Write an enzyme that holds these catalytic residues in place. Sequence first.
Site: not given
Ligand code: FEC
Lengths: 237, 248, 233, 235, 250
Positions: C129-133, C169
């Site tokens: 899925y895509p998303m925005s903030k 992811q």
């Molecule tokens: C699913 C899912 C979504 C979308 C749905 C939602 O956001 O409601 C989702 C959305 C986003 C979005 C946007 C961003 C960036 C937002 C921004 O930069 O403003 C965004 C950014 C990050 N996520 Fe994310 N996610 N996410 C995971 C799953 C999902 N994530 C899982 C699982 C892990 C577990 C980490 C791992 O073990 O690899 C995880 C961790 C991170 C880290 C960890 C810090 C790093 O990168 O150093 C960052 C930054």
Amino acid sequence: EAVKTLDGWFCLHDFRSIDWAAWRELNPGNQELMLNELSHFLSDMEITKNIGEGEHTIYSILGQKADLVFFTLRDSLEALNEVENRFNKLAIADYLLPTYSYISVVELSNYQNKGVRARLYPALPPKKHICFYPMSKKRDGADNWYMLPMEERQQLIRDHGLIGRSYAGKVQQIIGGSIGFDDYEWGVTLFSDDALEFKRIVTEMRFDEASARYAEFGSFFIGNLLLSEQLSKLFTI
Amino acid sequence: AVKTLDGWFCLHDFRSIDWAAWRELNPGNQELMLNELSHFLSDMEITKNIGEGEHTIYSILGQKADLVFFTLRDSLEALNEVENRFNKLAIADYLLPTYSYISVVELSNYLASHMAGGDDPYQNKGVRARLYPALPPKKHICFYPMSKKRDGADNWYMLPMEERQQLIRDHGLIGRSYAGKVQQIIGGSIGFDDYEWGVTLFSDDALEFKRIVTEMRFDEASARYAEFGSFFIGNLLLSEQLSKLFTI
Amino acid sequence: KTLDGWFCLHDFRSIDWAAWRELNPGNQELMLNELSHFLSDMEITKNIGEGEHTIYSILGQKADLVFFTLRDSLEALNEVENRFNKLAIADYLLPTYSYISVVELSYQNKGVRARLYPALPPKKHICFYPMSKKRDGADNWYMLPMEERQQLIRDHGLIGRSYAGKVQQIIGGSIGFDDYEWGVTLFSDDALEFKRIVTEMRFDEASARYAEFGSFFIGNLLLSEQLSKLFTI
Amino acid sequence: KTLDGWFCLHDFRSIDWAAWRELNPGNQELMLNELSHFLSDMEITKNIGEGEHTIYSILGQKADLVFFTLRDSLEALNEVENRFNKLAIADYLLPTYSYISVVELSNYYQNKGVRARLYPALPPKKHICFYPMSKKRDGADNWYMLPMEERQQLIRDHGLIGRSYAGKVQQIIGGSIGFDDYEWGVTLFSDDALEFKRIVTEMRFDEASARYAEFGSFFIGNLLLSEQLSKLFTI
Amino acid sequence: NEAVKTLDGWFCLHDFRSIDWAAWRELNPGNQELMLNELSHFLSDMEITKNIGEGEHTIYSILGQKADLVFFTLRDSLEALNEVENRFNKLAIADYLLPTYSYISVVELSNYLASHMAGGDDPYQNKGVRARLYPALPPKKHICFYPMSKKRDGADNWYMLPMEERQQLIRDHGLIGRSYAGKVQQIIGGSIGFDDYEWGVTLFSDDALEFKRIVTEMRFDEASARYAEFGSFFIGNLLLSEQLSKLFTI
Ligand code: FEC
Ligand code: FEC
Ligand code: FEC
Ligand code: FEC
Ligand code: FEC
Ligand code: NA
Ligand code: NA
Ligand code: NA
Ligand code: NA
Ligand code: NA
């Protein structure tokens, strides 16, 4: 509270895109026959215009939204419906794909007078360019035009009128009311010999409170006048 | 209200190639249609070389389009004539219209573009370079339309001029920090198309598009007031890339 | 501030069964042979470390297939797309949606390189899925101060950590490249984990207040055998 | 947190009458026979307890038919869909909408009552109603920012309304977060279609929906057994 | 808090069609005639159902590109309505009638105001009530159709209002409509649970400008100004058999 209006000709803005690939497959004989039929149809419409029972004009439209618009004005919805149905049954109309349309009635708001007939039954000026867009007034939280008191709406409309009067000479407008008739509340047609005047007037209006706070706009369409020399060139491959 | 200087009229013409129909043509007839397109583009180069316009072609990523034809002319009539002659090319039956945008190269008066005075800016050669822009042969293009919000407390058009000027000033500083990396053309489209500007970016590094657009999004002028349409990204197409592109 | 990796294309296709059915079996075989050649070409790019790709069958009418391709330049991604559309069989693969993004991480390091240039896990299912903030009144992500956003992102990350071994992811950034701001791809061997993690995140403030979602696509891994079955008619 | 049962496809089709009409009746009969064998295979899967399915004719132009199918895995569901699409007659069934979800039981597997709800027998009711919906996240009307206790209370009052339609409307709630474009697919069954209007109107004045519900398109239709399926396709 | 209750009458279909002129033009006149004969037979069957009191129907030609025609059909069950739609689609001529929009609703009378004395009687036995639930369609020159819903948007949330405030808003809206007695006849179809908006609104008038007048005046009344969300609007002209034959003649 409510605005009360005088209403004149019924209006159809009929936007078409030419199906070039289908048209190209037609033998040039068939093409000529279909343009001749269209040309007869337009001569009949010119009769109706000359006896003062309606108006019409054609512009070529820029971009992919349309290749042309047929803007037609009649004194009843039945006469308008009959133009439309006879147009669609022209052979050439199979190559004129429908991409957008607008139904409205020329409107004079209260916010045999010869100066009223001229507005209600407008002769179309043969300006080089046309601009068309529909619009509504907002009903969105605290920006709700239809909840405003009449005195505050009247002030807003007064200010809006001052701007447009400064474009007299440059820009001619026909305002079609479409509450009850189409998907927005007005259809706005502008005519000018300099297309930048459309940008200028619509921009100036957007910073006036009546539009800044309360206008909702549809799609915009701009084009160039099409007489017969340009109509025949249009279709020549 | 903002006042603008206005330059060339612009068409971004996005097309998707009907591969299934194209494939049905034998290569002789494909070559004939490509020859007719090259002749067409050679005519467009003449118009460019006599100073009456500009044009460029990029290949577009994803399904939104395969190509964009970006054309600039000194009148709406001339732009309309290019469009119509293009649709009447044989090859254009295989170029399906997927999106388009009409705009005019715009310089607003929020900041100064020349020393104030009676001297009219259309005679200023620096101003003319911006109104009648040369297109740079950068590897990549980014296109999107945008409008400024009129939404409750976030209403651009209800702000006083000095507040809009400050917001634009701050936006400009960010953009200026991408000098030498991103070149921008701003086309005004109030009255002409469905949004209020069409924004075209050029860069040799597509990631600079993400960088500048992200950075601007945290600047108040865009964070609070921008409304965006669809985004299109692509790669420069010269003749080499073009006949290659259509070889099936 | 982000680090950027492979450029990504998600390419969703619906199969034109009526036209496919009109082909005799020999011509079907020839078109599948060409497709297998193209896919073996993609696998060669993968095995030398210059990209990745995978194929999942999609539930529902939005698509029959998604081709998820990753490459080291926009030029290479464009060439793959164009070579794909020139396959004979692509005339039967009608485009229904697509997404362009770049793998995002907010360069000599191996664990970073493993994130920026990800190996695609052979998990049974995918979710895209895509998303925005949002920038919507008082719910405006881009008007928040740095330290408030940092706290909101931190908390979302703890949830993700709890799905280690259940969901993998890939986050693609798409500001400047497509219509939303991120493309989110999830992989799991239990499709219900998609529902669990995405629901859990939706109650976290970063998403509850600020997420704007596009369409959701869900699918099952297609290898060579399931590909041949798919097209047997 | 939820319990999850069968995966669900709602598959909406419009019939291409102009093309169907061009077929001679023998070929039309051969295509219907092939569909008959496909549905009898679907009935085996139903009879063995590995899924369910039903068909309703849909009013208006959105669709002529809905095929509502339930299976115990996304793979089985995908395999139904692909085999259906490869039926000769499917060339005449144009796809106009679909929805993917999973039967859902929230906490707002060995139990027999729980299993009857997760793996639901479809009732042969005269009428069906389908619509998707999501909970709003819009300024002060944000379901997902509500404390757990406030949400529990709102759901409680919503369930009280649903209970009062027992014996009139039977509901299947499919969760679709992660699976489709809304958060739930809602399927209602009743012998009186006005009960759909009644229950959905009454819920709309209950705070849980009044403030927080976001609805997609609504579909309603009539049960199609074998009798009515043949007549539907007879020109 | 207290939900509206309704009385419900005929189930309704608004079926909008665009004519495929290019295809129709390719038929020879003999085959066009056969298709129009078959259509006339289907319409006379509709007329029979009307004349025994089990439904109603009417046809208008629609202005603009949204449709060439609307077929508005009312029936006493969803099965009968579905059977009419399916028989229509299987007419030969229906291949030339492309679907452009449709709406499903049921003639609705709510309890915001009284439609009969609260004396213990079955409202469905009151002939005045029956005339509204099972409406005879007037042969007015023009029709106007649009769907609409009531907003649930922040401070403008109809469904969070107390019954007595909704009743006040409906009461004031009704006084405006009452002032168009003899000029505009309305059918309100309820569509919660049946279609994508909450009502389908059909207006009939011999003067199309009365549509613009009433809809504009209601838009300055709080019930609509603050709470109405509108769909698309369709307007048209009455089509009887004669105008139908002209419509299809090339
Ligand atoms: C699913 C899912 C979504 C979308 C749905 C939602 O956001 O409601 C989702 C959305 C986003 C979005 C946007 C961003 C960036 C937002 C921004 O930069 O403003 C965004 C950014 C990050 N996520 Fe994310 N996610 N996410 C995971 C799953 C999902 N994530 C899982 C699982 C892990 C577990 C980490 C791992 O073990 O690899 C995880 C961790 C991170 C880290 C960890 C810090 C790093 O990168 O150093 C960052 C930054
Ligand atoms: C262009 C354009 C638009 C749409 C763009 C926008 O709304 O931003 C536009 C929009 C509207 C709209 C709605 C209304 C009706 C609003 C309502 O009835 O609530 C509406 C109504 C009026 N306009 Fe308007 N306009 N407009 C001109 C151009 C445009 N106008 C030009 C030029 C003139 C001046 C020329 C002339 O009056 O003959 C002009 C004047 C008037 C007057 C007369 C005012 C006066 O006498 O002081 C009335 C009433
Ligand atoms: C990228 C991008 C966008 C769209 C995305 C977004 O706005 O979030 C973008 C959006 C807009 C929009 C609308 C407008 C018009 C706003 C208005 O007239 O209300 C608009 C208008 C201007 N921009 Fe703009 N931009 N922009 C650059 C890139 C982007 N710009 C770069 C780069 C430079 C730097 C040029 C240089 O190197 O000197 C730059 C500068 C200007 C100046 C000159 C301001 C100044 O002199 O300080 C004006 C005026
Ligand atoms: C109809 C309809 C809708 C959608 C329209 C709307 O939301 O306006 C509708 C919507 C939902 C939605 C979402 C949810 C889940 C929302 C969430 O978990 O956040 C959701 C969840 C529940 N519903 Fe619901 N419904 N619903 C019924 C009908 C409808 N229901 C009928 C009937 C009953 C009668 C129950 C029974 O059969 O035993 C009933 C009961 C429940 C219970 C019962 C729990 C308990 O026993 O305490 C839970 C949980
Ligand atoms: C036109 C038009 C619209 C749509 C445009 C708009 O802005 O509302 C319109 C919209 C609606 C809508 C929804 C509803 C349902 C409201 C609800 O239950 O929330 C709705 C409901 C009612 N209307 Fe309405 N209308 N309306 C008339 C015309 C229009 N009406 C005319 C005329 C009369 C006058 C009838 C007469 O006196 O003969 C009239 C009266 C009523 C009565 C009072 C009689 C009754 O109890 O049924 C009720 C209730
Ligand atoms: Na055009
Ligand atoms: Na592309
Ligand atoms: Na699928
Ligand atoms: Na139907
Ligand atoms: Na029409």
